[PDB]
Structure 1
Amino acid sequence: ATLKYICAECSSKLSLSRTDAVRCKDCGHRILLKARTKRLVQFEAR
């Protein structure tokens, strides 16, 4: 349950906020994506 940001390589759910640095629980590589939404997305079949 719950996830905030992910890493460009070692896709490990992180989670932060201001000043808490912008790195990862290991890999220095300071990228990070902001994982999907909770509210489902609805599509049409055409």
Structure 2
Amino acid sequence: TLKYICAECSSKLSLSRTDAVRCKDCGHRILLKARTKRLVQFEAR
């Protein structure tokens, strides 16, 4: 449901609530939540 990236193999994953928080490709247990899709405003100062 929500988008995650593995720590070192950089694989994209979709996680629901009941899913265990682990990587399905290499078995690593550290996942980073994805960058938001919305545009983010920065003043150039």
SS at match of 2:33: coil
The answer to which structure has the higher strand fraction is 2
State the 1:3 CA deviation. Answer: 6.6
Count of paired positions: 45
TM-score when scaled to structure 2? 0.78
Query: Which of structure 1's runs of 4+ aligned residues deviate more than 4 A?
Result: none
User: Equivalent pairs: percent with the same residue?
Assistant: 100
State the 1:25 CA deviation. Answer: 2.0
In the alignment, structure 2 segments of 5+ residues that lack a partner are none
Q: Provide the aligned C-alpha RMSD in A.
A: 2.0
Per-residue CA distance 1:16-38 (angstroms, 9 max, x = gap):
11222111122221110001111
For residues 1-46 of structure 1, the aligned pairs below 5 Å read 4-46=3-45
